[PDB]
Short mmCIF file of C-alpha atoms and ligand atoms in Angstrom, two decimals:
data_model
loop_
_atom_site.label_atom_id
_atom_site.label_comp_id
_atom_site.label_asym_id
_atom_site.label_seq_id
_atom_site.Cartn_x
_atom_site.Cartn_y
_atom_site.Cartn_z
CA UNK A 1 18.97 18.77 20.28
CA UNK A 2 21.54 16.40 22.03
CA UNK A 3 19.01 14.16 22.94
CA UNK A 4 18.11 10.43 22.00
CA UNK A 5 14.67 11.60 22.02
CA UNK A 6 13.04 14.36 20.65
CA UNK A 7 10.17 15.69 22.40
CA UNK A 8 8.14 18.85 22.47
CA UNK A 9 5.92 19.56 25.19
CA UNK A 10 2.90 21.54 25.38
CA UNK A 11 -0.08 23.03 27.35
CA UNK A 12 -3.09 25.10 26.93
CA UNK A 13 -3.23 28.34 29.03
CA UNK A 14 -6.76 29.27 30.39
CA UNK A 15 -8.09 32.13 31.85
CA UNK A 16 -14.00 20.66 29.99
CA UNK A 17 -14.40 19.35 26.49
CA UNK A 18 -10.04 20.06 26.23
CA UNK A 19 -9.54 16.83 24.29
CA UNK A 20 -11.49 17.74 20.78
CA UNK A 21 -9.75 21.26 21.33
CA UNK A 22 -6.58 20.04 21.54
CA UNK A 23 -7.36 17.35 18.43
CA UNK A 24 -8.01 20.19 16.36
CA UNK A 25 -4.89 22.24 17.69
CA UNK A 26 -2.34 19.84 16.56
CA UNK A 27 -3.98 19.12 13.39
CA UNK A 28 -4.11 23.31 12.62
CA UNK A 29 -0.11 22.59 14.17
CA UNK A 30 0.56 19.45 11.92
CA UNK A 31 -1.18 21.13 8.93
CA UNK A 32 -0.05 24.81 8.74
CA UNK A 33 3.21 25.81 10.31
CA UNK A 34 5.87 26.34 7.60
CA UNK A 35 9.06 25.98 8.67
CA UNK A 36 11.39 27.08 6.09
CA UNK A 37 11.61 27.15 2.50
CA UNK A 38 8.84 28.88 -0.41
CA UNK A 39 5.88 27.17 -1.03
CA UNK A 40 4.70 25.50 -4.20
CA UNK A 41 7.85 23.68 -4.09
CA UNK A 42 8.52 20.27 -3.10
CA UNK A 43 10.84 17.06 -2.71
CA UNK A 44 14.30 18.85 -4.75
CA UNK A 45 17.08 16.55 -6.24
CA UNK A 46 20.24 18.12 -7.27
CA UNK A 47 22.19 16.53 -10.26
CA UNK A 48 25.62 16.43 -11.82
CA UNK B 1 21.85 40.11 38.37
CA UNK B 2 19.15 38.24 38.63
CA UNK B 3 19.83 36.30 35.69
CA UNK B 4 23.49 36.45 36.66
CA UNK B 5 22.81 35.30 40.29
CA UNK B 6 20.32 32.24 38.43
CA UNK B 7 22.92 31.14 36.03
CA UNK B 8 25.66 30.44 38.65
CA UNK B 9 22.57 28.67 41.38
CA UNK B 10 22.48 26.27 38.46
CA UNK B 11 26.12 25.96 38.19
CA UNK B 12 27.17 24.93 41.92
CA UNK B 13 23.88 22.77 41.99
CA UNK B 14 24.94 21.02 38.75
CA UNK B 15 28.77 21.01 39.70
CA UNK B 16 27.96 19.95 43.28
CA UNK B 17 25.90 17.07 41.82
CA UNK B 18 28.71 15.76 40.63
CA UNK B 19 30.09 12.25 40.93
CA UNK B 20 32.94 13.86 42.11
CA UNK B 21 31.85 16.17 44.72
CA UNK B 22 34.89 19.02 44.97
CA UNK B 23 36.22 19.87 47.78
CA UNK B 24 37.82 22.86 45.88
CA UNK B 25 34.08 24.31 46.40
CA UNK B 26 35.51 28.09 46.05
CA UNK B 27 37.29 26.95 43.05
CA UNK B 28 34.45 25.06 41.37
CA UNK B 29 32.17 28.02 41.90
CA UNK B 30 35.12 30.67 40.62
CA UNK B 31 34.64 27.68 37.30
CA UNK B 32 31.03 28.88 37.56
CA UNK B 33 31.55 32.66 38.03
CA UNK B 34 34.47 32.65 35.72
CA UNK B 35 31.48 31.09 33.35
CA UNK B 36 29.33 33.01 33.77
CA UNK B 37 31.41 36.17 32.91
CA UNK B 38 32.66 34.30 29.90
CA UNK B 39 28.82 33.24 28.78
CA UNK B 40 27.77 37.18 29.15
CA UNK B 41 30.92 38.14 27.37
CA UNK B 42 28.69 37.21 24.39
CA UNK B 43 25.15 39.39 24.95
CA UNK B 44 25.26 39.68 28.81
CA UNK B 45 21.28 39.77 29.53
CA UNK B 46 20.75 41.99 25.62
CA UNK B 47 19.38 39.00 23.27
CA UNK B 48 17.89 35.27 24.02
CA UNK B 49 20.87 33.53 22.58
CA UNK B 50 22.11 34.00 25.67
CA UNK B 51 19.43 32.01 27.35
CA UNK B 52 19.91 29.51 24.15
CA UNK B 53 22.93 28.84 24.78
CA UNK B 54 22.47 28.40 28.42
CA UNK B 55 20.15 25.95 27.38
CA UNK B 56 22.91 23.98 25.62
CA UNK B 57 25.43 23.74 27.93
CA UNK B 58 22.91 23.21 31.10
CA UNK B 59 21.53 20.47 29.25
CA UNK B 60 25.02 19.07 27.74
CA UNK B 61 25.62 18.93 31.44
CA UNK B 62 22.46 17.35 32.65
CA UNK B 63 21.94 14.83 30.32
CA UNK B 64 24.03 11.52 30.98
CA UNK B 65 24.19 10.12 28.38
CA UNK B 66 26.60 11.69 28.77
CA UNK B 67 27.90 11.57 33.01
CA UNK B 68 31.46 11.72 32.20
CA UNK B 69 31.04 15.36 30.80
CA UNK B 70 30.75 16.37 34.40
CA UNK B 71 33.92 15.25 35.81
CA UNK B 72 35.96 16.55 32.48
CA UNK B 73 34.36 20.33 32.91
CA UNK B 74 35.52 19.60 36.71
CA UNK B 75 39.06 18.98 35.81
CA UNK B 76 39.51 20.74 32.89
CA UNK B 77 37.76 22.26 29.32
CA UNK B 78 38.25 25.73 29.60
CA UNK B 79 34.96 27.74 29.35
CA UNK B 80 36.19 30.79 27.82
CA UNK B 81 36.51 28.20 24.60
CA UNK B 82 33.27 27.04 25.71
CA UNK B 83 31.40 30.69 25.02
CA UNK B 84 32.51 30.15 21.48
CA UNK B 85 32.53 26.63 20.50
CA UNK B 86 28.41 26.22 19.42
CA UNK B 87 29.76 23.50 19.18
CA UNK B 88 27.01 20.89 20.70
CA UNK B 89 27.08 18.69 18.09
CA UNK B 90 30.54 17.62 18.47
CA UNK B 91 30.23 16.49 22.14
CA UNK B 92 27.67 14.47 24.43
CA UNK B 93 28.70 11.65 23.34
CA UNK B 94 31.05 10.28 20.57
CA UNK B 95 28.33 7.64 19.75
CA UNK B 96 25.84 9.80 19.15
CA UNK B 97 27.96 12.14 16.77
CA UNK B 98 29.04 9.12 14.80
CA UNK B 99 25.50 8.71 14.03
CA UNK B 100 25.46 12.28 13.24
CA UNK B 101 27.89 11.56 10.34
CA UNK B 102 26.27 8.42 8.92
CA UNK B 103 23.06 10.48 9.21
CA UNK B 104 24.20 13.15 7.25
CA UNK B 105 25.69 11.29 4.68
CA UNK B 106 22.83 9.34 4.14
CA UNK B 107 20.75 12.50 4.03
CA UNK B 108 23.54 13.51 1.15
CA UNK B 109 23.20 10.55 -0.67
CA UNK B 110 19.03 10.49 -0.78
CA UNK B 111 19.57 14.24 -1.94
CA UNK B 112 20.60 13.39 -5.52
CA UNK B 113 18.23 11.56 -7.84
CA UNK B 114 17.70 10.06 -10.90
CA UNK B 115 20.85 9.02 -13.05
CA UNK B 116 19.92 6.95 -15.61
CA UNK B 117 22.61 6.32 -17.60
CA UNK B 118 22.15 5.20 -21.45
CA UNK B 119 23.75 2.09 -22.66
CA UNK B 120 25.71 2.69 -26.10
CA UNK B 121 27.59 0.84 -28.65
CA UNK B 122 30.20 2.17 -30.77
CA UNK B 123 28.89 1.48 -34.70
CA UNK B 124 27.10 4.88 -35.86
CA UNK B 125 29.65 7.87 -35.46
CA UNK B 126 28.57 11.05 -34.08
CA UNK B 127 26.82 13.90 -36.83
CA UNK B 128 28.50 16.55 -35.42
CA UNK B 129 31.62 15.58 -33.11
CA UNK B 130 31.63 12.64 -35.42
CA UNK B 131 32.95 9.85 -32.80
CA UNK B 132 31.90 6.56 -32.22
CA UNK B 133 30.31 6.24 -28.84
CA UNK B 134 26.57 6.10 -29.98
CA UNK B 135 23.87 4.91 -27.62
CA UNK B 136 20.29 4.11 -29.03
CA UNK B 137 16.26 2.78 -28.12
CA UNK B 138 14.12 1.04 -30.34
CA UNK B 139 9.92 1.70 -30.07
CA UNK B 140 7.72 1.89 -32.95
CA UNK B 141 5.68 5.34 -34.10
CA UNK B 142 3.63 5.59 -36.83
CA UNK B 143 1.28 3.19 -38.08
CA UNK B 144 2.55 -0.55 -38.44
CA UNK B 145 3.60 -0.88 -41.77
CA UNK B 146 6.75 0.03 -41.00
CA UNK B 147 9.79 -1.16 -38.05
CA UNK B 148 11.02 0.48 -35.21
CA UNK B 149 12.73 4.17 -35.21
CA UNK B 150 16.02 3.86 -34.24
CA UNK B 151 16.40 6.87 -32.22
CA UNK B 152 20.34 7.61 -31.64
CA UNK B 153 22.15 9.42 -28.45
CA UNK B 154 25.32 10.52 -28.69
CA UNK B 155 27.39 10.60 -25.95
CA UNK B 156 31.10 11.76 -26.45
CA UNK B 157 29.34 15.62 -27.01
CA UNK B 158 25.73 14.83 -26.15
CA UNK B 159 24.24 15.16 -30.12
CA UNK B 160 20.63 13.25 -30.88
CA UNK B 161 19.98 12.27 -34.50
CA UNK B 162 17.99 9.24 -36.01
CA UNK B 163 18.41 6.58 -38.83
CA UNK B 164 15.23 5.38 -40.80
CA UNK C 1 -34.79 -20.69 9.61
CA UNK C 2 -38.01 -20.97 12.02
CA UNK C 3 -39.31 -23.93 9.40
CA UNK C 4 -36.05 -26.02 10.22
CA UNK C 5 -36.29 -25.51 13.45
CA UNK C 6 -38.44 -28.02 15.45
CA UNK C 7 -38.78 -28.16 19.32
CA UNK C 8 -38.37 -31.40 21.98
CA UNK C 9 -39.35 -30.40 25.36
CA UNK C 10 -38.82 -33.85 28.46
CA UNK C 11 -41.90 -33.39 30.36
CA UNK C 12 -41.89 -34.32 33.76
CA UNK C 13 -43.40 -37.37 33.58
CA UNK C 14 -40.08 -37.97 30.95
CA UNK C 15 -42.93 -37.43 27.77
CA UNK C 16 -40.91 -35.90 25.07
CA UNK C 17 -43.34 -33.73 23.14
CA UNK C 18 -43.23 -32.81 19.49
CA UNK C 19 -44.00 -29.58 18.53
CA UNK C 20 -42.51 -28.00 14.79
CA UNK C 21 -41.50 -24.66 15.59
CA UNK C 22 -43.20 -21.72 13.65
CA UNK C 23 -41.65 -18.68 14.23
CA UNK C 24 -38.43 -16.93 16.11
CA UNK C 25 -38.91 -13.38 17.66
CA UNK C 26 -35.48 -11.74 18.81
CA UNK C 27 -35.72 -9.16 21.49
CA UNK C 28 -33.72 -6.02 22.56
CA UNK C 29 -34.11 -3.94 25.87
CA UNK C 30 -35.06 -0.52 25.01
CA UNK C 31 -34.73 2.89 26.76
CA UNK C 32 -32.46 1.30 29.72
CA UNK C 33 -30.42 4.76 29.97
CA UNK C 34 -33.51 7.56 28.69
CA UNK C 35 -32.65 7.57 25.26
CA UNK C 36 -32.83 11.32 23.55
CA UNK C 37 -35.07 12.96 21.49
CA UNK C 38 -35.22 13.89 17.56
CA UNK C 39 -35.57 17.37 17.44
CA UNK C 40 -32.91 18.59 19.98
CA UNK C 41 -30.92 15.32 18.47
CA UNK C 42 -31.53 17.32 15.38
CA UNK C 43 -30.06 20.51 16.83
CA UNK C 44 -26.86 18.37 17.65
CA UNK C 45 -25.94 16.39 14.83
CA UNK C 46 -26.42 19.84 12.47
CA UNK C 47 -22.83 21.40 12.49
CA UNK C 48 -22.99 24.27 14.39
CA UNK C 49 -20.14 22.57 16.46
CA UNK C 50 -16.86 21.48 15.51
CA UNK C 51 -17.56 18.70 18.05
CA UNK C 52 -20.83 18.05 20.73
CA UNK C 53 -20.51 18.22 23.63
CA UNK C 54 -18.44 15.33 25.63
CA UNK C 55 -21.07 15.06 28.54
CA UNK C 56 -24.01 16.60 26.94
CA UNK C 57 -26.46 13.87 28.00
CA UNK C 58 -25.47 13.94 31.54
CA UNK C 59 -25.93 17.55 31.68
CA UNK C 60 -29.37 17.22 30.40
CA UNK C 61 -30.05 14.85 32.60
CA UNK C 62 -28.76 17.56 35.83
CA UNK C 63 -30.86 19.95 33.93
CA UNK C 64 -33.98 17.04 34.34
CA UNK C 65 -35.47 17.04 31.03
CA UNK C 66 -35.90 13.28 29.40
CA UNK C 67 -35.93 10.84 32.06
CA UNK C 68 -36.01 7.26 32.07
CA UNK C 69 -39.64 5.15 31.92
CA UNK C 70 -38.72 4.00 35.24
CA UNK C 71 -37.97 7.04 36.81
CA UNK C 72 -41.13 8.94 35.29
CA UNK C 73 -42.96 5.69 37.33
CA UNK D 1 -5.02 2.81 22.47
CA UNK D 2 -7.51 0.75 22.63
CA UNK D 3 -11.15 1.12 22.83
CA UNK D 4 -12.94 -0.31 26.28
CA UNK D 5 -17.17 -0.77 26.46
CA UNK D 6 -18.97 -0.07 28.77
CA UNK D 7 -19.71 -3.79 30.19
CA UNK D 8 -23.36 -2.54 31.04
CA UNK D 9 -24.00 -1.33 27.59
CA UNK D 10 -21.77 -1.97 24.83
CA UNK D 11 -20.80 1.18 24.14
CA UNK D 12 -17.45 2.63 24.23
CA UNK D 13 -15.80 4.75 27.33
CA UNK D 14 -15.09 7.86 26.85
CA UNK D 15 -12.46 10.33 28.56
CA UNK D 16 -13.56 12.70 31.07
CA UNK D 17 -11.95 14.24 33.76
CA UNK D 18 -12.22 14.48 37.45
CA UNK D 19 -12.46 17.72 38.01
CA UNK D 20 -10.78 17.73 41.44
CA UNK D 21 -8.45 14.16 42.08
CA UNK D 22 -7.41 14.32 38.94
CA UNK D 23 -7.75 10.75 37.57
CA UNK D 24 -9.17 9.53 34.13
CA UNK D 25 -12.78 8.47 34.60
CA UNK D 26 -13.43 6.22 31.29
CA UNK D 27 -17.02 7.19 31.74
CA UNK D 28 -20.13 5.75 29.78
CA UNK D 29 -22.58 8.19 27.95
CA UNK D 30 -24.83 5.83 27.63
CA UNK D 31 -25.60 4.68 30.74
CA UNK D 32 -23.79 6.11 33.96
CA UNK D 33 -21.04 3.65 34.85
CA UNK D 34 -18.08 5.41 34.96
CA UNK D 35 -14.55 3.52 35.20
CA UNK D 36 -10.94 4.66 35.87
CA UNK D 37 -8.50 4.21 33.09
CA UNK D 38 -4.59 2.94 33.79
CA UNK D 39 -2.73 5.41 32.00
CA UNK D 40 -2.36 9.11 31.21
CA UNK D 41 -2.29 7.96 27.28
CA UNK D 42 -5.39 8.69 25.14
CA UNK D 43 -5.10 9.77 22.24
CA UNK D 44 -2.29 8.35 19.43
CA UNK D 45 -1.73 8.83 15.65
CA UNK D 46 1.05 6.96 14.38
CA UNK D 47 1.96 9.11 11.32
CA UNK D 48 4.07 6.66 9.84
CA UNK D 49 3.05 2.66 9.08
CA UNK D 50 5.44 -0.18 8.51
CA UNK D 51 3.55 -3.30 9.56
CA UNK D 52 2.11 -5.77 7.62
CA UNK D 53 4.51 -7.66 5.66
CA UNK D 54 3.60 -11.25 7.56
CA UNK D 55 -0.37 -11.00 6.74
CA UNK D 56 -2.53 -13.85 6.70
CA UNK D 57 -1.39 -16.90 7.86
CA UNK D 58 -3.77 -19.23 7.90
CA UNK D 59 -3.18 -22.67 9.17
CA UNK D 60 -3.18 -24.68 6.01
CA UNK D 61 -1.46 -22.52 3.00
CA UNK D 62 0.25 -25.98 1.91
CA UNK D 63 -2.85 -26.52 0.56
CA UNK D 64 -2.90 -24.15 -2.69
CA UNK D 65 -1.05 -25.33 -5.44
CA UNK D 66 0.17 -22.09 -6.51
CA UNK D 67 2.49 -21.11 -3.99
CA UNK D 68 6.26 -21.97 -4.93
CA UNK D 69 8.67 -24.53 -2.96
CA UNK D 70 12.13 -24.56 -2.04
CA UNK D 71 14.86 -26.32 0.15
CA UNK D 72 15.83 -24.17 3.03
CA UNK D 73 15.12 -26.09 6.41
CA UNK D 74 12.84 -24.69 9.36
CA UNK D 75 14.92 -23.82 11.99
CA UNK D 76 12.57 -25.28 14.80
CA UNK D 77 12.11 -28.77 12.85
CA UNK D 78 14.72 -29.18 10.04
CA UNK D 79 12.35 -30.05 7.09
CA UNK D 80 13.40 -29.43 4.33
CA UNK D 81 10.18 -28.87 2.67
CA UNK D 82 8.31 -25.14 3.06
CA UNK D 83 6.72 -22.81 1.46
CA UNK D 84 7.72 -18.95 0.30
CA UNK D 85 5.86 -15.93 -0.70
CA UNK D 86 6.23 -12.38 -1.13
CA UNK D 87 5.43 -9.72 1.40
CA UNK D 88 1.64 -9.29 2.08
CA UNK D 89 1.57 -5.54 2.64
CA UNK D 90 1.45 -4.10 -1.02
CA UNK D 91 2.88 -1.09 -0.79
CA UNK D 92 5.53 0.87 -3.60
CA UNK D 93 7.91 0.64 -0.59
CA UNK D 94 8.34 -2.47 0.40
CA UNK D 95 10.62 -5.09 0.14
CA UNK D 96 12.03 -8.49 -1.82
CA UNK D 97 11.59 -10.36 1.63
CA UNK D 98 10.63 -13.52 1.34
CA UNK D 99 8.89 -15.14 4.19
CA UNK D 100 9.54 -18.97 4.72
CA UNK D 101 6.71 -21.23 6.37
CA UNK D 102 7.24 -24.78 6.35
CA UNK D 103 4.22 -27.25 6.57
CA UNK D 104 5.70 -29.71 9.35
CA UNK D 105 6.34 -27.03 12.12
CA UNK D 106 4.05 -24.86 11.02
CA UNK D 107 6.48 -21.86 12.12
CA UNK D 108 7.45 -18.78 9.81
CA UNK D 109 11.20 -17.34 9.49
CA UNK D 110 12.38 -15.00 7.51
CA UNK D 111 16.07 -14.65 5.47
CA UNK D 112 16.53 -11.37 6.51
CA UNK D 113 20.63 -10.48 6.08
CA UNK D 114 20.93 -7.32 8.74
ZN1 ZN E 201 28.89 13.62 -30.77
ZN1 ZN E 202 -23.01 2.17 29.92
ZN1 ZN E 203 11.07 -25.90 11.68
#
């Protein structure tokens, strides 16, 4: 986290044709993993 | 002792990497043993925080930005401390935690939304509180042969009324 | 525009001859790499994959099937 | 991230590997010429756009009418004639930059106050 860059690297383990495999990966990646908070809620302002 | 023996390779390769190469080699690896006891003082080899925070510091250490880190662990910041600080966002480097803070505070300020804020006058008095700090809109809304609607806001206790 | 069009050829005596232009044919090369075939083409484009095969057409051409005009020659 | 043909048959290389030096054979499937690619990048996304706020310059916008005028000077050629207009990229987002071009040098500058 103390970098000026942040980067996460990863591979593929196997027991061809990788790169459409690894398109729909990250989009499965990009799309699904929650990370915190409840869904069915979104952008939340606070006021006074 | 594996992990032990791992931990402290990593120590006197990182602290003999250093700019300043020690010649106190038995003292710079007692640093790293004394270290190492003082990192496994918190799970010693029972939960991955351990490894997390070996990650920190090894890294802290590496990095460079920052290089001086290296030579101020070699001459002083005492490790026991160092167990407990979690405190990686507060060193590695100054610069970079100042744009923690502005960060943060801009985060903080994009939390907190809409304030629109209602213009008044001071003419109408209030029907309830009954003070004169009366705020207002004008729109049309029935059919056009009438005016506006003169919808009122108070604002000294909040009240909403309405002249014809 | 093959009416606009209107053609001056030097002959080689230097007679410039005058001939109006009828029509302009445009050609393409065709079946320079052994082009595919509907049906298995068929079979591909139907989505049965989430994507076809990177290489298939080189493999089918290891495999042998669908060569080129010049090769069957 | 850009897209290379195959100069045999215009038809764009694609990615496959060497399956024992390791190297990126930009191969055609249409024909068989095969070519090696410079670097390990492929693939890119770009998840978040901010480009496109200086579109369209053609050589002559002096000549519309409708397109206000002002006094700041170019800072190549000291006119003091140009021409201003809003950012091209119509987004909600954007900004009030203003984008001076002045018809002697022909050369755009912004007033941006960073
Ligand atoms: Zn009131
Ligand atoms: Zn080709
Ligand atoms: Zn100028």
């Amino acid at each position: 986290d103390n970098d000026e860059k942040l980067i996460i690297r990863c591979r593929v383990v196997r027991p061809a044709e990788e790169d459409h495999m690894l398109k729909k990966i990250e989009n499965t990646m990009l799309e699904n993993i929650t990370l915190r908070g409840v869904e069915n809620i979104e952008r939340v302002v606070m006021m006074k | 002792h594996k992990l032990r023996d791992q931990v402290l390779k990593a120590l006197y390769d990182v602290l003999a990497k250093e700019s300043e190469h020690p010649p106190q080699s038995i003292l710079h690896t007692a640093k790293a043993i004394e270290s190492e006891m003082n990192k496994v003082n918190n799970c010693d080899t029972n939960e991955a925080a351990y490894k997390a925070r070996y990650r920190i510091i090894y890294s802290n250490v590496i990095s460079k930005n920052n290089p001086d880190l290296k030579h101020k662990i070699a001459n002083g910041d005492i490790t026991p401390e160092f167990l407990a600080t979690c405190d990686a966002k507060d060193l590695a480097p100054a610069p970079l935690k100042q744009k923690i803070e502005e960060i943060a505070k801009q985060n903080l300020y994009n939390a907190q939304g809409a304030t629109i804020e209602r213009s008044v006058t001071d003419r109408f008095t209030c029907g309830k509180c009954k003070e004169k700090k009366v705020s207002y809109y004008q729109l049309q809304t029935r059919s056009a042969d009438e005016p506006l609607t003169t919808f009122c806001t108070c604002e000294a206790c909040g009240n909403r009324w309405k002249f014809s | 525009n093959s009416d606009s069009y209107v053609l001056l050829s030097v002959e080689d005596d230097g007679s410039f001859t005058m001939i109006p232009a009828d029509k302009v044919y445009k050609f393409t090369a065709r079946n320079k790499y052994a082009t595919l075939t509907i049906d298995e083409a068929e079979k591909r484009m139907d989505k049965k994959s989430g994507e076809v095969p990177r290489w298939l057409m080189k493999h089918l051409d290891n495999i042998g099937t669908t060569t080129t005009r010049y090769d069957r020659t | 991230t850009t897209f290379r043909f195959c100069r045999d048959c215009n038809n764009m290389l694609y990615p496959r590997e060497d399956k024992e030096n390791n190297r990126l054979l930009f191969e055609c499937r249409t024909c068989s010429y095969v070519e090696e690619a410079g670097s390990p990048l492929v693939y890119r996304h770009e998840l978040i756009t901010n480009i496109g706020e200086t579109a369209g310059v053609v050589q002559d916008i002096g000549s519309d009418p409708t397109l206000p005028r002002s006094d700041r000077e170019c800072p190549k050629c000291h006119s003091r004639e140009n021409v201003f207009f809003q950012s091209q990229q119509r987004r909600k987002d954007t900004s009030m930059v203003l984008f001076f071009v002045c018809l002697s040098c022909s050369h755009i500058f912004t007033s941006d106050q960073k």
